[PDB]
Design a protein around this ligand. Sequence first.
Ligand SMILES: [Mg+2]
Ligand SMILES: [Mg+2]
Length: 114
Amino acid sequence: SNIIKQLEQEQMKQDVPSFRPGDTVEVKVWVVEGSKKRLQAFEGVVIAIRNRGLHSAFTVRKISNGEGVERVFQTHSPVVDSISVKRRGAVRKAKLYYLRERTGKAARIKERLN
RNA sequence: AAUACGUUCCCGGGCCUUGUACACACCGCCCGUCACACCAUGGGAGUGGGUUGCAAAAGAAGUAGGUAGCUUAACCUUCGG
Ligand SMILES: [Mg+2]
Ligand SMILES: [Mg+2]
């Protein structure tokens, strides 16, 4: 516990920016592209956050080619290179699972602006 | 030797006439089922395409309308905007 807490926080990123459910987020991820290693962008809406120290995670949801793609990131993974908020969204819930039944015009999210 | 009134009836034939779908001409012509082969076609549980009405759903780009957020060399500035 202390031992574990101590093992876990020496592995934790220090500069995770603040973001919240409904925000539009761009995550830059390290990938091996054939024989290259590059950053690849993945942009979408944060529909779920799991706050849990080192095991923190978050689910980003986007539309590719008419169909939805959801990516669960482990926030502290070295695979995740950076996170940046592209727009601040206004929602009430913590978990936006209802957006999965919505498409295009129905799935929009107002801007927070404050 | 017998017998013949007579021509209604049988058979062959002649002339006039009539009907005919016959003309290798009534031993003529021709009809439908049935059997076999071929052709095209209708119906047929269905199978696969084209086009189309109605009722809704969808909403890329563009253009126009609105505009709190962000941003801005030329004009105004009392230099803050
Ligand atoms: Mg006679
Ligand atoms: Mg037929």
